Amino acid sequence: TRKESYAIYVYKVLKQVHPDTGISSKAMSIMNSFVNDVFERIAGEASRLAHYNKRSTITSREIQTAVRLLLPGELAKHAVSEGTKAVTKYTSA
Amino acid sequence: TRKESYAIYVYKVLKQVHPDTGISSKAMSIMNSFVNDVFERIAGEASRLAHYNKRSTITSREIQTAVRLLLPGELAKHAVSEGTKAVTKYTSA
Amino acid sequence: AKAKTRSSRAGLQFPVGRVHRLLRKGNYAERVGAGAPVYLAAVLEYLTAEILELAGNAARDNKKTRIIPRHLQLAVRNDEELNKLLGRVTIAQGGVLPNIQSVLLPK
Amino acid sequence: AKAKTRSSRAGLQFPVGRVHRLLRKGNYAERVGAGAPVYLAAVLEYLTAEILELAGNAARDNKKTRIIPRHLQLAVRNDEELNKLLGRVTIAQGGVLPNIQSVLLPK
Amino acid sequence: AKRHRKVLRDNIQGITKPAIRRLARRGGVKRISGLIYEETRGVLKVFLENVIRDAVTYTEHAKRKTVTAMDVVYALKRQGRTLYGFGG
Amino acid sequence: KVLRDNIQGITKPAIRRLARRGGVKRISGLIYEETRGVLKVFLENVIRDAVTYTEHAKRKTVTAMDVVYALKRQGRTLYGFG
Amino acid sequence: LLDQTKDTRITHLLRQTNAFLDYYNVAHRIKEDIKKQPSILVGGTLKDYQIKGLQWMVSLFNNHLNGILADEMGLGKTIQTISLLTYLYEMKNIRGPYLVIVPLSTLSNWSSEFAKWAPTLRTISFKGSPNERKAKQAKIRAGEFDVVLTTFEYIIKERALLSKVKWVHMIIDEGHRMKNAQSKLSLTLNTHYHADYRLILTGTPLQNNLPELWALLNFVLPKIFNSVKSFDEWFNTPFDKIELSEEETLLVIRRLHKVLRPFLLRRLKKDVEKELPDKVEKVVKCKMSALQQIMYQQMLKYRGFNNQIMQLKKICNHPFVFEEVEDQINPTRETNDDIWRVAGKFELLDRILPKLKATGHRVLIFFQMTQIMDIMEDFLRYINIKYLRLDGHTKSDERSELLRLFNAPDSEYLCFILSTRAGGLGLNLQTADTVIIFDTDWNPHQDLQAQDRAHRIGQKNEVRILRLITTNSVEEVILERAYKKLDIDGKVIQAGKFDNKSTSEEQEALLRSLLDAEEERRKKREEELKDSEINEILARNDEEMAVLTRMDEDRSKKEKSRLREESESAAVYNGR
Amino acid sequence: RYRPGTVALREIRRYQKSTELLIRKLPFQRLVREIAQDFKTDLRFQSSAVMALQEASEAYLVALFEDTNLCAIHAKRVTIMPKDIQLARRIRGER
Amino acid sequence: KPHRYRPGTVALREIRRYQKSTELLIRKLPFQRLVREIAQDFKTDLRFQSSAVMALQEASEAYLVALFEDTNLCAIHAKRVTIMPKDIQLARRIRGER
DNA sequence: TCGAGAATCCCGGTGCCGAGGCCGCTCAATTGGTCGTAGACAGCTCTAGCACCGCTTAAACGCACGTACGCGCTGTCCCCCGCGTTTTAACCGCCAAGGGGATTACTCCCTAGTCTCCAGGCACGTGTCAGATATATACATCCTGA
DNA sequence: TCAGGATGTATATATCTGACACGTGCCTGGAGACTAGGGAGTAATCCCCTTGGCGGTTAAAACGCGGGGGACAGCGCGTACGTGCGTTTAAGCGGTGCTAGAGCTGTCTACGACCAATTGAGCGGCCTCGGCACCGGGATTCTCGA
Numbered sequence A, B: 001t002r003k004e005s006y007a008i009y010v011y012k013v014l015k016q017v018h019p020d021t022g023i024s025s026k027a028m029s030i031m032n033s034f035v036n037d038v039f040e041r042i043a044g045e046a047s048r049l050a051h052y053n054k055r056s057t058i059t060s061r062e063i064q065t066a067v068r069l070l071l072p073g074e075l076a077k078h079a080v081s082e083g084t085k086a087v088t089k090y091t092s093a
Numbered sequence C, D: 001a002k003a004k005t006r007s008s009r010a011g012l013q014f015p016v017g018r019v020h021r022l023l024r025k026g027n028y029a030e031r032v033g034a035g036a037p038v039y040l041a042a043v044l045e046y047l048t049a050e051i052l053e054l055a056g057n058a059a060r061d062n063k064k065t066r067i068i069p070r071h072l073q074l075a076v077r078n079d080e081e082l083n084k085l086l087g088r089v090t091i092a093q094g095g096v097l098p099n100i101q102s103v104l105l106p107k
Numbered sequence E: 001a002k003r004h005r006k007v008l009r010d011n012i013q014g015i016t017k018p019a020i021r022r023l024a025r026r027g028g029v030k031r032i033s034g035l036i037y038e039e040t041r042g043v044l045k046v047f048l049e050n051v052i053r054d055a056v057t058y059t060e061h062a063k064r065k066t067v068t069a070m071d072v073v074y075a076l077k078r079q080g081r082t083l084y085g086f087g088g
Numbered sequence F: 001k002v003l004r005d006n007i008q009g010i011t012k013p014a015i016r017r018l019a020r021r022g023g024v025k026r027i028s029g030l031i032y033e034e035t036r037g038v039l040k041v042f043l044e045n046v047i048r049d050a051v052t053y054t055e056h057a058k059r060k061t062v063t064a065m066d067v068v069y070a071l072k073r074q075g076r077t078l079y080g081f082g
Numbered sequence G: 001l002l003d004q005t006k007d008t009r010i011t012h013l014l015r016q017t018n019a020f021l022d023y024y025n026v027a028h029r030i031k032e033d034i035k036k037q038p039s040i041l042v043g044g045t046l047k048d049y050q051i052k053g054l055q056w057m058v059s060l061f062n063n064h065l066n067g068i069l070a071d072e073m074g075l076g077k078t079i080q081t082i083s084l085l086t087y088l089y090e091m092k093n094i095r096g097p098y099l100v101i102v103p104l105s106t107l108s109n110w111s112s113e114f115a116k117w118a119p120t121l122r123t124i125s126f127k128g129s130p131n132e133r134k135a136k137q138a139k140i141r142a143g144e145f146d147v148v149l150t151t152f153e154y155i156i157k158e159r160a161l162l163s164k165v166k167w168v169h170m171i172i173d174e175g176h177r178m179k180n181a182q183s184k185l186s187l188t189l190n191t192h193y194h195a196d197y198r199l200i201l202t203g204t205p206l207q208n209n210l211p212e213l214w215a216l217l218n219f220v221l222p223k224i225f226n227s228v229k230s231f232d233e234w235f236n237t238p239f240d241k242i243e244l245s246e247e248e249t250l251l252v253i254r255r256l257h258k259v260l261r262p263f264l265l266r267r268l269k270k271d272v273e274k275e276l277p278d279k280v281e282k283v284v285k286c287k288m289s290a291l292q293q294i295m296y297q298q299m300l301k302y303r304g305f306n307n308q309i310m311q312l313k314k315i316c317n318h319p320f321v322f323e324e325v326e327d328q329i330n331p332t333r334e335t336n337d338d339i340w341r342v343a344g345k346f347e348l349l350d351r352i353l354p355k356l357k358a359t360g361h362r363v364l365i366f367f368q369m370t371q372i373m374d375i376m377e378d379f380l381r382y383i384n385i386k387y388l389r390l391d392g393h394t395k396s397d398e399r400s401e402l403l404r405l406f407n408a409p410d411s412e413y414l415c416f417i418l419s420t421r422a423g424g425l426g427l428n429l430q431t432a433d434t435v436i437i438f439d440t441d442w443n444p445h446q447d448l449q450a451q452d453r454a455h456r457i458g459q460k461n462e463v464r465i466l467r468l469i470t471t472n473s474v475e476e477v478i479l480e481r482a483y484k485k486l487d488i489d490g491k492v493i494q495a496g497k498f499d500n501k502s503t504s505e506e507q508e509a510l511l512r513s514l515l516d517a518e519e520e521r522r523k524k525r526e527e528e529l530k531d532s533e534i535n536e537i538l539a540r541n542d543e544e545m546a547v548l549t550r551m552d553e554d555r556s557k558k559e560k561s562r563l564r565e566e567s568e569s570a571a572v573y574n575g576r
Numbered sequence H: 001r002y003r004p005g006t007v008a009l010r011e012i013r014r015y016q017k018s019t020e021l022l023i024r025k026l027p028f029q030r031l032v033r034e035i036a037q038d039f040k041t042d043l044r045f046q047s048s049a050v051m052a053l054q055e056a057s058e059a060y061l062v063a064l065f066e067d068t069n070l071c072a073i074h075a076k077r078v079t080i081m082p083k084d085i086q087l088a089r090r091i092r093g094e095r
Numbered sequence I: 001k002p003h004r005y006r007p008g009t010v011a012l013r014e015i016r017r018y019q020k021s022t023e024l025l026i027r028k029l030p031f032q033r034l035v036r037e038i039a040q041d042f043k044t045d046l047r048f049q050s051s052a053v054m055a056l057q058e059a060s061e062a063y064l065v066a067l068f069e070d071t072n073l074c075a076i077h078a079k080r081v082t083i084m085p086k087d088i089q090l091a092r093r094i095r096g097e098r
Numbered sequence J: 001t002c003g004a005g006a007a008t009c010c011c012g013g014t015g016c017c018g019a020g021g022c023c024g025c026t027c028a029a030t031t032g033g034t035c036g037t038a039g040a041c042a043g044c045t046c047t048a049g050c051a052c053c054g055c056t057t058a059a060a061c062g063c064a065c066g067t068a069c070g071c072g073c074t075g076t077c078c079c080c081c082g083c084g085t086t087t088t089a090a091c092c093g094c095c096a097a098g099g100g101g102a103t104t105a106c107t108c109c110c111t112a113g114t115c116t117c118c119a120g121g122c123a124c125g126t127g128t129c130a131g132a133t134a135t136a137t138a139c140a141t142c143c144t145g146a
Numbered sequence K: 001t002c003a004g005g006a007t008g009t010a011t012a013t014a015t016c017t018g019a020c021a022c023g024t025g026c027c028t029g030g031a032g033a034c035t036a037g038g039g040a041g042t043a044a045t046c047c048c049c050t051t052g053g054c055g056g057t058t059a060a061a062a063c064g065c066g067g068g069g070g071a072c073a074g075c076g077c078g079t080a081c082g083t084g085c086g087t088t089t090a091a092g093c094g095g096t097g098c099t100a101g102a103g104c105t106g107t108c109t110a111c112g113a114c115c116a117a118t119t120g121a122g123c124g125g126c127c128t129c130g131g132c133a134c135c136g137g138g139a140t141t142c143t144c145g146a
């Protein structure tokens, strides 16, 4: 049985922000439950937005509006900025 | 465009409980939004219970446990009683 | 053969078929069992029957034969369990239960 | 041709493919677009980068080079927006921000 | 005055001392301090901003210029306060 | 094996320490029993939800995941345990 | 085709006459005429028109038939109602209970012609607070009176009372106010129980589009109330000009005349007198200012909502109607020299005013509401030319009081402000002369409605009308559409003008000559700053041309100019 | 003249008796439009939407004055104060 | 005379001490026996993982800490430095938990 | 305003168990192709939303005035804190039994899917009465004085 | 403590209407019938994590005992808010004029589901080694009685 997690990814991002700082296993578990939490939130709001507008497909627009609903203020603005840049670079190349 | 509702059904149940009493249109709208609300609650809890236990099928057991989670106390007991009786009579005949 | 509605088999007034459709297209799970719409429709019938029963009793107490949102506000909030279920709900045109703190009354 | 990961195309460290799978099998909608896992993974990268940034700053302020749940409690609650997002969250081994009401201090 | 109006108090002041007074009479309040009014206007403005930003968000997502009742219902249910009778 | 008076196992110094962390300076002598009642109610709720989850899965063991789903079920999210 | 309406609606005329209780004969079958007035009428002069119209409406009375008065204006609907009741029930003596309802703009007026032009018929009015009413319908609660004179909304509030008693003959005024049958007034007139005889008075028929010809002839008559949805395709006449005008215009409109002859009645002032001095109608044009003109392209470029129509009407009239603009122009908002130098309407206005007061002739002006009239008050007070003011929100006390303040010939005030909608029906004046209209008739029936308040029976002066419009603006396009509509009903109401006695040759006379007029304005479809041109309007004789040269040694001779930071800053604050 | 506090109680029973809306339409609608101007310009509102915001707003303020009354009465005072309001909003977790 | 601190100083030093660390303030075995007793009334013969009991201890202790924070806010609003049961049940009445 | 002294920070030293990197070993992520279909875009209709004014009147506003209550101050007493002493149950470390979670192999039958057929329910009308309103009349209650 | 008046509040009858209850034509979604297949049930085995016990240590809890400070009651002052009245004033209702965008349809096409082939990123098991817990001593700081 292989149970996957986000551990190595939070580790990589941590080494990007603070290359000299490590993280304990418990804090890694907290980060994992955080990523799963926020993921289920944005996915749920995307499902609601897709159901109310009568569409069967989740696109970047529904995820964008969901981010603008969940994240207050600057988290929403910078989050939509980073995500839009990521989809931009993704489909451009 | 035909927009369906629960109006006539709440009307029938009302005529079962109180045959002599009528209902205003606004109260019928409140009853409609109530039935839709509770429906989305029980269906959502059933989806969560089906996802956590790793099953792709919603059966009467998941709906039962969802009713026992949402409805406090006697509403849960009598609700599970009526529902179990309804499935009983349904599959029996 | 003549088609008989599944709502009439279990003795339910609610549309077992419609509930089944909403469970199929509601993106809840990938597959839906055969007892889910019957059981769920029965639960909804019990809840609706109770809230309409209390609403009818309140309407009869107010000498009005037509249920109004005020009678739903009173019928719910006067009941403990339905108040615990609906505690987060704001009912339109509901009003507030008459209440005064005993310390505010003259003496 | 040599397969290149979609996470490397957009410049994301998070598994765009895994997010896409979770959106497909998560019973969210019936169909999933091609920009949803990229955009969502980017948002998660921003949030994780911020919370780990504040956690690293708090760890550096406490003279500890290893992040502990206390540093997550401080790093979150000291920030206004993350406190508004996580206000309903109970972090294990978090503790409480040091606080004393000014009226309780001697004079 | 008469030559030019200058009668504008804006809008949030359009919520009147007797209005808030009545809302307090319904809540069970007996006597009211003179400073309750400004605070009540501030709180009302806050709550209205919180709901309206969401309703306008749902409106912009659908690519519509009209804010309907369903948008407000989904904003209230979005913030945890459920409303009945207007649809849902 | 009937268990009784175990809520008395919660000690006056314990609750006292919880209040010292909560910012409370001085405590009245009547806080204790009430705090025990409140804690017992909370545990009744969370434990009935978790035990409900455990009954639905036909398992005899209550996993930490069930407790997490009960807390998130009530609206209090607990990170770090899964 | 539809002549089933000819024979069948003639037999239907028999159905009203006997069964309810050439169209010149079978509909009018009960005949009479008298050129003598009823004995109750006192202090009035008898002309020829209200005779034929008098026993014409009496001919509608004896046959038990309703009707509409299609006449121009100034023919004394009040006279026909007074002499109507006083003659009829001078004979029969029943004399009541009878209902008359008029706009609140003129109420005590109608009672004033119920005062001097005849006594012996009492009046029940409704005005002011509920107390005076409590006195009135508390005294008359037992229902004894000759006539009730009321207004519109008091049958809506007092419909719970005055509709209980039985009525016979009602008089409702200004059918254009009636308009739609979907309006609450209409459907609540069925809550009014029944009054056998009816009538409607109007200065002009309904809107150019005319879907509501239905509503009209439903409230006017038993005729068409059976089938509501019929005529909407039969309205296609108004909406190959020779062939389309032929089939549509000639066919359908010949049908409309064929059916509608014995209902509407219209005449002119030249028919009764010829004392009408001129056609008494002109227009003018104006210019703009660059600082204001930038608002056209910039503020039109803003495209927040509904402004594009609202923005240009204001800025060509006043910049100061906008609060922020007026604030940024000057902080002090004191009376200033540059208030009238911002636009051209105030420049040419300051040009005409010295000649206005010079010639000793007065002027009427119509306005938009709210800030426009305020700023005009500020200008007329700035150069100090005294003025009355009138508008919708004023009370009835100073409504009638101001009406009396006009009637004094010693008046030192020449101009004054009056509301198009509120006051357009608000006065009856033989002594006025000059008229000006800014709004440019969102409905033409309102501009021609309030337009005739100058020329009147016994006018010893010569009327001139001016439409003040600025070039390169939406408002002259609104004038374009305005006389486009004047053509639209030009096939309807200008077709309805030759119908009085049901003549023959005059209809094609107005088709060839009038058709040359609509063709003339087909040419029209696709300055005056010097003293002489403006002198030409108000001259009307060489004597006035000579006496206006005394104003040329200052306005022209004069022993700055019209016209940036306000443009950029204005663009900043208006960009919200 | 009535003793002070009697008219207040009669108003309590009166307004708690009926369902009437306690805020006038047009001012509240202009307020909603002003607040909505700061988000997206040139928006259209259905009447049922403004009525919805009025229902939720009035009910929210009624509950807020209930809890505020509980605070004032807990302080042994019959007069609510701003610190009672902001106290209730501090305990609810809204700030 | 033996040196004694003025009443209220030790309480503040304890406030800083316990607010400084992450330590759990309730002893394991009593809390575990309490959880088991409460769980007996639902389904008999249940098995608990250690991480589950630790979870209930985390949520319970954090909940009581927040409850004492709001209760302290009530007591201070009453112009008193001593929390009382009416402050607790007041906070639980305003939160909507009763 | 100051020393005695008890608690706390700081610094140097030591031992350890979890953080961090490596290495097979998958199995899910990537690529390449199809195949049907959701929605993108253009077009048409027409409904409700926007502005504005007329007109009435219930509500708001400003103000005069009284007295009810919030708040400051004081005294009392009681009860909870700070500390010492004594007891006990938590804790840790180890050991042992075992049963319930976890997985895998086999099988079957419940539901998705499609086609066919028809009536349960829905928009549109029609009539019609529950109650909202108005008038008249009498009871409940507060406020006053006795 | 107890009677009299004025105000608001309840009751009885009449009346008048707009929303509610019922019938109707129709049509699209629900029921019946049939088929395939894959997910869920079920038997069997493995093991690891739970429960239970025992013994030795000791930090922590219970119990008591002074005493000082805070909870609470009382009292008095002053000022701020209720209450009523005359005066404005926009709210409410209506009515006009325009048109922007909600709402539906009809194509038509890019786009995502789905299956076969392939392989390398991530994971479980497995090794170091060092950042941090723990301790012992000294210097420093904050509290309390002179």
Ligand SMILES: Nc1ncnc2c1ncn2[C@@H]1O[C@H](COP(=O)(O)OP(=O)(O)O)[C@@H](O)[C@H]1O
Residues within 6 Å of the ligand: G044, G045, G046, G047, G071, G073, G074, G075, G076, G077, G078, G079, G428, G429, G430, G457, G458
């Ligand atoms: N014979 C007459 N002599 C003098 N004045 C007359 C005569 N007939 C009519 N008038 C004028 O006509 C006015 C009444 O006309 P009015 O009733 O307003 O016509 P309408 O109602 O058609 O506009 C009066 O003011 C009166 O001065």
Ligand code: BEF
Residues within 6 Å of the ligand: G073, G074, G075, G076, G203, G427, G428, G429, G452, G453
């Ligand atoms: F005589 Be018109 F009606 F001015």
Ligand SMILES: [Mg+2]
Residues within 6 Å of the ligand: G077, G173
């Ligand atoms: Mg007239």
